[PDB]
A paper describes a structure:
Merbecoviruses from bats, pangolins, and hedgehogs pose significant zoonotic threats, with a limited understanding of receptor binding by their spike (S) proteins.
Here, we report the cryo–electron microscopy (cryo-EM) structures of the GD-BatCoV and SE-PangolinCoV RBDs bound to hDPP4. The GD-BatCoV and SE-PangolinCoV RBDs exhibit weak and strong affinities for hDPP4, respectively. In the complex structure of GD-BatCoV-RBD:hDPP4, the total buried surface area (BSA) is 1586.9 Å2 with 764.4 and 822.5 Å2 on RBD and hDPP4, respectively. In region 4, Q540GD of GD-BatCoV-RBD forms a single hydrogen bond with the glycan linked to hDPP4 residue Asn229DPP4 (region 4). Therefore, the interface in the GD-BatCoV-RBD:hDPP4 complex is substantially twisted by comparison with other RBD:hDPP4 complexes. We further found that the interaction between D541GD and Arg336DPP4 in region 3 could be a major determinant for the twisted hDPP4 binding by the GD-BatCoV-RBD. Although D541GD is conserved in SE-PangolinCoV, MERS-CoV, and HKU4-BatCoV, only D541 from GD-BatCoV-RBD forms a salt bridge with Arg336DPP4, bringing the Arg336DPP4 loop closer to GD-BatCoV-RBD, thus leading to the observed deviation in hDPP4 binding by the GD-BatCoV-RBD. In contrast, N229DDPP4 has a weaker effect for GD-BatCoV-RBD (433.3 nM versus 255.4 nM) and SE-PanglinCoV-RBD (111.8 nM versus 9.4 nM).
Author numbering:
A (entry chain B): 385 to 430, 433 to 581, 586 to 590
B (entry chain A), C (entry chain C): 39 to 766
Amino acid sequence: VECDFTKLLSGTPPQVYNFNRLVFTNCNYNLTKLLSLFMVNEFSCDSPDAIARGCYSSLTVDYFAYPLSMKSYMQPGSAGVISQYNYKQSFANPTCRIFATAPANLTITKPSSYSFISKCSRLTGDNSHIETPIVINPGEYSICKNFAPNGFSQDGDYFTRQLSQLEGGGILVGVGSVTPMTDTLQMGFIISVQYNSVCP
Amino acid sequence: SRKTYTLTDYLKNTYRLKLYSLRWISDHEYLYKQENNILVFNAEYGNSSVFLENSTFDEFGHSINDYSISPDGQFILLEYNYVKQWRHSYTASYDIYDLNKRQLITEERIPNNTQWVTWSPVGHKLAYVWNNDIYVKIEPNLPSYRITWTGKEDIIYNGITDWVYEEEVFSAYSALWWSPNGTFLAYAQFNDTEVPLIEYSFYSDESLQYPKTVRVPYPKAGAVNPTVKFFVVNTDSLSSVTNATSIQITAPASMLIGDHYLCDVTWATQERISLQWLRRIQNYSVMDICDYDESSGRWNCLVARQHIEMSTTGWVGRFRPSEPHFTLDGNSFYKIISNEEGYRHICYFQIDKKDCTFITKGTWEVIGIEALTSDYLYYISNEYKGMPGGRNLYKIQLSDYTKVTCLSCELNPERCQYYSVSFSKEAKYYQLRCSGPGLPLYTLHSSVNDKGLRVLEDNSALDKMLQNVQMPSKKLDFIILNETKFWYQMILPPHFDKSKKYPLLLDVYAGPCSQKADTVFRLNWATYLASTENIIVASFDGRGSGYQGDKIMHAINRRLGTFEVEDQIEAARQFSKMGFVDNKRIAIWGWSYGGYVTSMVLGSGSGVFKCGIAVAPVSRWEYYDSVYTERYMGLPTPEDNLDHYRNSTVMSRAENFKQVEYLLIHGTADDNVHFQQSAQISKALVDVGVDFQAMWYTDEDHGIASSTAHQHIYTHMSHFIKQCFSLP
Amino acid sequence: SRKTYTLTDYLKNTYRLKLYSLRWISDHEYLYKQENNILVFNAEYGNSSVFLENSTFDEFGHSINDYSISPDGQFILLEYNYVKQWRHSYTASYDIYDLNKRQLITEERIPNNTQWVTWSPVGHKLAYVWNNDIYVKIEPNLPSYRITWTGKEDIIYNGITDWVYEEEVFSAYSALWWSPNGTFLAYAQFNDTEVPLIEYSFYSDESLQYPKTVRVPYPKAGAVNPTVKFFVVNTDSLSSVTNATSIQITAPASMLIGDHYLCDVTWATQERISLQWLRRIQNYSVMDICDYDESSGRWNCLVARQHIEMSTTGWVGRFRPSEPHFTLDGNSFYKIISNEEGYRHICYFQIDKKDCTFITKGTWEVIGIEALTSDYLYYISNEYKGMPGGRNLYKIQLSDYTKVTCLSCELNPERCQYYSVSFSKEAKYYQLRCSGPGLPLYTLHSSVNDKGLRVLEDNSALDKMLQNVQMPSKKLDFIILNETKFWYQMILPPHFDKSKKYPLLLDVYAGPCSQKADTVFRLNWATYLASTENIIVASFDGRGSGYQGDKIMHAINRRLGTFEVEDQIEAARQFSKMGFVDNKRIAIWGWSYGGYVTSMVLGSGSGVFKCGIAVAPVSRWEYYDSVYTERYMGLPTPEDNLDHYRNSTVMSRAENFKQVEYLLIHGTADDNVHFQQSAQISKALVDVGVDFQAMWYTDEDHGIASSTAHQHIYTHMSHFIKQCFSLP
Ligand SMILES: *[C@@H]1O[C@H](CO)[C@@H](O[C@@H]2O[C@H](CO)[C@@H](O[C@@H]3O[C@H](CO)[C@@H](O)[C@H](O)[C@@H]3O)[C@H](O)[C@H]2NC(C)=O)[C@H](O)[C@H]1NC(C)=O
Ligand SMILES: *[C@@H]1O[C@H](CO)[C@@H](O[C@@H]2O[C@H](CO)[C@@H](O)[C@H](O)[C@H]2NC(C)=O)[C@H](O)[C@H]1NC(C)=O
Ligand SMILES: *[C@@H]1O[C@H](CO)[C@@H](O[C@@H]2O[C@H](CO)[C@@H](O)[C@H](O)[C@H]2NC(C)=O)[C@H](O)[C@H]1NC(C)=O
Ligand SMILES: *[C@@H]1O[C@H](CO)[C@@H](O[C@@H]2O[C@H](CO)[C@@H](O)[C@H](O)[C@H]2NC(C)=O)[C@H](O)[C@H]1NC(C)=O
Ligand SMILES: *[C@@H]1O[C@H](CO)[C@@H](O[C@@H]2O[C@H](CO)[C@@H](O)[C@H](O)[C@H]2NC(C)=O)[C@H](O)[C@H]1NC(C)=O
Ligand SMILES: *[C@@H]1O[C@H](CO)[C@@H](O[C@@H]2O[C@H](CO)[C@@H](O)[C@H](O)[C@H]2NC(C)=O)[C@H](O)[C@H]1NC(C)=O
Ligand SMILES: *[C@@H]1O[C@H](CO)[C@@H](O[C@@H]2O[C@H](CO)[C@@H](O)[C@H](O)[C@H]2NC(C)=O)[C@H](O)[C@H]1NC(C)=O
Ligand SMILES: *[C@@H]1O[C@H](CO)[C@@H](O[C@@H]2O[C@H](CO)[C@@H](O)[C@H](O)[C@H]2NC(C)=O)[C@H](O)[C@H]1NC(C)=O
Ligand SMILES: *[C@@H]1O[C@H](CO)[C@@H](O)[C@H](O)[C@H]1NC(C)=O
Ligand SMILES: *[C@@H]1O[C@H](CO)[C@@H](O)[C@H](O)[C@H]1NC(C)=O
Ligand SMILES: *[C@@H]1O[C@H](CO)[C@@H](O)[C@H](O)[C@H]1NC(C)=O
Ligand SMILES: *[C@@H]1O[C@H](CO)[C@@H](O)[C@H](O)[C@H]1NC(C)=O
Ligand SMILES: *[C@@H]1O[C@H](CO)[C@@H](O)[C@H](O)[C@H]1NC(C)=O
Ligand SMILES: *[C@@H]1O[C@H](CO)[C@@H](O)[C@H](O)[C@H]1NC(C)=O
Ligand SMILES: *[C@@H]1O[C@H](CO)[C@@H](O)[C@H](O)[C@H]1NC(C)=O
Ligand SMILES: *[C@@H]1O[C@H](CO)[C@@H](O)[C@H](O)[C@H]1NC(C)=O
């Protein structure tokens, strides 16, 4: 059949920790229409021409709400709190990232705000005084995802849940911050692909 | 012969103690209010020059109450229409008067019913709270900027403390903390939504025919505590076209397990703030040190910078955890924590290294840290002659910790033994405020070479008036008991001989970390009782009294009313077997917690005591507030400590009151210890059928500080004591 | 010297006055409950039958305190789970027990927390009030029919009265009035929406850690008052398929111009009712008589049928305007109407005639009509020997008004002088309950020939056990002060001698239309004080006392707290000048109004009295409720009576309290005279600076009726009296 980037523009976008992997366009792959409707703000990854033309095997996508006023924590090399807790870039496959801004047209629906976990550490000990942060894999979700994955209402929201064994056996504390809503919605597009059916 | 200290002299305050209250405004200049005139004084020379005139403020139709000075000296802040709300909180009107233009600023006045106004430490920035909202003025003749929009009456408190925090945690109405150079404003937000209220009727003046009912958010023992949040707002980036953004600093995740408190906030340097948090089970506290980054403008508190204080035997701190004292660079600080032996001493702390090195050691407790410079550190301790009552000033050398110099040990050994200090801005000068066995003496010193500059006050005319009149004499000693010295005081009558037996009134507080045998000169009701009626008034420091190590203080942990009561009874027994005390005329009286101790001693059935007064006593620990009761008893949860919660009631000992005479006094409009408590005591006493005396004082707070009510209550107490002792 | 009437004898009720309480179910018979068994007594021949046994009582799972009998005798109503709310109001649970089947009814039982249940006068119709809504059951085993849908807690009362009407106007909790044969149900609906609320805290048992607040609609003096409506529903046309409807009988046109009350409701004949309305300015009352209209289905009231009672010199009636006593045909009625001279007497009325002809005349007052069959009218009056303190039963022939016979004057002149009577259904038999100077004696009489059939109770055992105690005497006499006869009573100690001087305690009530000098046998605190402490307890009837003419009673109109105070002072002066009263040991005590009179006497500065007790006194008349204050003082508008409202306060004369000893006792949960009044008294007394004693009684009503608190308060007043009089 014929497939394209239709499921990315439906409903409300999720946040950076609540990221949605999707695998589609197996038979045919469509080029330069998601970039046409949603303009690009930067393109630097470890080229547009190499990912534009050339057949592939399996293409995956990543999209989440990500403001442009804060961009520097997610780099190929960085020490941001978002990189260590929420999402880390995957380097196992040729991938490139894209930050997009919604135009004045209201094709997408805006969420309440942009939110992200500031602390996802594990509490363990006799008096629960030893603190150990939980770093996350680039291809795995943070364990603080179940603390309101829709979003955080205020800046200081903390939600705690006792972890199951088979996970560490300590109390988990998840604190999520929030940034104020901008004028228009803003998208973080990350595309990974590996080398044959997915061809333009 | 000569006259004695009468009750009229005490109530009318004829013999008035002269004080010298000065506020430092610079390195070497301080203010003084002499004859309703603000006077600038010089520390080095002593010459005084006039700062504010008489007529410059009385030209208005409202009499001023107090003055606040800007650090630059450009403006004076005057307050009037003073209305007291609680012990610390009040509402008043404010106005700003310029000193260069010498006129009043009526451009944008501070609105009426202002809750709390503070100046910036430098410059002339203002931060006043109105309707539980934070307003900041860069200049007094400029429009104000609104910081918090979520303030609400008795629900959300922004920048001002609620009832429980003001009474116990912060001991103040202020929750605003400026940066050291007046750039960042730090405020705390208190949420009171799920906390239950307390209702007491307020029968106002006779014109009003329907009494009002007061609603106070009051978390009792086992109730839900208020939720605290912490914010810091940058005041340099303020604009009138957009809302100010406040960056929230979250609590450490060790405290996010359950309920927690914010107990101390201290600014380290211009971009670093140190927060101290206290758990609901007040035996585990962590200090959070947060830095301000420039890349994001978010306050980051590293895990490695957290410092953990815990107590395995009792509660951390004396009442609240002690504040740190940072150095100039802010990379290290000095803090007072308990050592391995159980005595509070000073640790040199590093903001990155967890361990502390003790710089003081011994069998004495460091009372507090007063001033820190790069060369020396000044502190107050009770080391000198080993008396826990006495206080003296010591300075230690930061380079060599074994060289300790005392600055108030030998200034006046027979007169001044309880010293208090007040350093300058650079701590170049300190005014010593002794209040020892003699009259209070106020001296001014310079810290460059510890030379006495002059004497500010010595109460000469008061000395003549007191040498005219017969006055009681104090006596400080101790008893051995269970191989641990316990100190006591006795206000002996004039011309006191051991052969004649005197009646005893055991003035008792016996609270946790309370001192009642200090060398402090006071003109109180006990001086009238000793001087006129010839009554030995005594106080005791049993188990739970502070400044004597954690072994004594923490013996009363999770058990109130069973140990200090036994120590008070034992002290009465020892006093009776001293020889000069009539055993048949021993009484007991106390205030608040002292009333609870008095009620428990009378209900213990020991038979030592004849009559007892308990003004505003504590009855059941499930009626007092959450912080104070849970610090020393824990939650009233029936798997943890409900047995001692239900065993430590006065009403369980109501049958034993038949052998003693009880006088129960309480205020109807009390907010600290409610009228419910004395209502329950009276209900138990009339259900058992015990004859007792009672008295209620309407529209009276816990202090009962109104002059007519104070005179009436002390006259009634004197009448009850005289009728109990059958004094001529 | 045998034993005396001790305090514990009064407190523990060792000497119990035996009561013979009976209820007539028919002309012939009556029921007397004895040994927890119900017995039918045939009044002619004795004939002690049985009605209920112990088996019904112990077969149920809960205790039963009160019973009610259906008039046909086929059902008994049992009351359990008694929870008292006010003086007359209560809530309880009910169940109907059939007697024909000897089984308990289990279908559609009366719901829990039912405010008021009443039986129909004939048949077995049952109407009860639950959640301020009226439910009518034709049969006890049938579902109820809802009458009112507008019931609301503390807002709208249907079939029951609110606080003010129950306390003052109706003196009962029942606002339901059945038709004479149980066809119509007439109820009054009360609106409480603009009535301001009183709020006093309620400290419950020790488990409750937060005191509840009691919210009561309490119309104070000059405030908004409840609005009363009237309705009549038809129980014969009750159907479950549709809502029952009622017809509102409106007030007369002379009452709707201003605020009005509804004081008395009486079913005149089988199909007509006689409503009695009273103005807010309580000196103008109009009785409205309304007839049922069969053609229209509504109730019409004629202007010519209205009868107007007026009082120029003061208020109308004694407390409330008296109820009429209609004849059998309903074409005439008898009412107590004040004469032109002032004394209240029976006046024969007609429905369509304005004028009435008085049937009794003299310088005495008729207390009230009791019964009339067709030819004699039975009334109680104080005509005998010119004693307003004595009551006797009189009968008068209807045809010839000169024929007046006393049925209780000569029965026992030396023992009984205070008669109260209870009649049968057709008034052929009446039980005379004399409580005169002697012990209470109960007799049974037949009205046909006025012969004593038998005595029901004569207190033989109490007369046996009263020989071992020194009972106090009782002297009733008069003094002539202002050319008028003023009566007084004295409880004298045994072996009383005129030579020896005794202490005098003036037990004073002094309320408007209050008799304190009657010949009623009492076993109370005065008996203990006279017998044991040898204290003369005296009472006086000054200006404002009732049953002595309108000239004495209405002299206090619009001036409260002036003439009764000087009357009490002059009575004390006369008592001290008689000779047997010690002039330096005179005290005074009172309850409610008595406390107010005691407070104004002590604050008057007369100096006659030594000490005083005021148990729940009235302080300011703006604090007390609207009906009682406005009846004798008028509204406190600035242009009518505000001057004497602000001149007749206790707090205005607190300066003169320094010469006397004051004891101030008040219950915190008091709803009649709130704690606000004693709080204001205490505040004024500590503002002036007067030493006095006090005691609050938590969770206590106006009467202090709980046994432990009653014993404690009487022990404390005994201790205060003994200490004041310098007695052992
Ligand atoms: C101060 O504390 C109170 C509670 O102690 C806070 O009120 C709470 O506000 C949250 C919203 O942030 C409410 O949650 C909401 O509940 C509704 C109903 O269950 C639900 O439909 C929503 O999806 C949301 O979960 C919460 O119920 C409410 N709690 C109350 C009213 O007891 C209050 O927000 C705090 N103050 C500030 C300034 O945050
Ligand atoms: C602070 O006090 C709490 C209880 O008030 C202590 O917690 C208990 O410690 C014992 C020690 O074995 C355990 O058995 C209990 O299960 C603990 N209870 C709870 C609720 O945690 C605690 O040890 C104290 N000291 C700290 C926190 O340093
Ligand atoms: C600053 O914040 C406050 C609080 O959010 C804003 O005030 C509210 O604004 C909304 C939107 O106009 C109104 O619906 C509310 O009624 C306002 N509440 C109050 C109490 O005023 C305010 O508008 C903000 N100011 C700016 C400049 O954005
Ligand atoms: C008050 O202290 C603050 C905190 O350091 C100062 O703010 C910084 O000042 C430095 C230079 O001293 C600048 O490089 C930073 O950009 C400033 N940061 C911010 C957030 O303002 C401030 O300058 C000081 N004010 C005064 C008058 O000395
Ligand atoms: C109870 O009294 C009512 C009121 O009079 C009686 O009802 C009336 O009875 C007469 C006699 O038959 C009728 O003519 C009327 O139409 C009835 N009026 C109403 C409104 O019902 C009733 O009969 C009496 N009860 C008994 C059992 O006789
Ligand atoms: C009880 O009284 C209140 C007022 O005292 C009544 O409320 C009024 O109802 C009328 C409807 O006829 C409205 O026009 C008024 O505006 C209402 N006033 C207020 C203050 O609410 C209420 O209806 C009465 N209740 C009953 C059952 O009679
Ligand atoms: C009798 O009257 C009551 C009150 O007027 C009726 O109850 C109301 O019925 C309506 C629907 O018809 C509801 O919307 C209301 O909520 C009801 N009120 C209450 C207090 O229950 C009742 O339906 C009527 N019954 C008949 C048989 O007419
Ligand atoms: C009921 O009492 C009121 C007030 O006590 C009387 O009203 C006064 O009447 C006199 C004589 O007419 C006037 O001089 C006053 O101005 C009235 N006062 C007010 C406030 O209206 C009233 O007349 C009395 N009613 C009767 C029938 O005697
Ligand atoms: C100022 O007022 C005080 C007291 O009000 C008075 O003693 C003094 O003389 C006045 N003048 C100066 C210059 O202090
Ligand atoms: C005291 O005198 C010195 C000069 O000797 C002067 O500089 C100083 O300002 C004076 N102090 C005051 C407060 O006027
Ligand atoms: C405060 O009250 C006074 C008294 O009327 C008034 O003159 C003044 O304007 C008020 N303050 C403000 C800011 O309105
Ligand atoms: C404490 O209370 C419990 C139960 O209430 C009881 O078993 C125990 O004996 C009490 N301990 C005392 C009174 O010392
Ligand atoms: C019923 O019980 C009471 C006491 O409970 C007893 O005095 C009485 O004799 C009993 N009567 C019968 C008939 O059993
Ligand atoms: C007693 O009363 C019963 C019914 O109550 C009656 O049958 C009996 O005849 C009466 N005894 C007499 C009249 O002697
Ligand atoms: C009253 O309460 C009891 C127990 O609470 C219950 O058994 C009974 O059914 C209730 N009455 C009614 C009418 O529901
Ligand atoms: C009330 O007292 C005042 C005294 O200030 C007096 O002038 C006035 O006449 C009095 N009013 C009366 C007695 O009605």
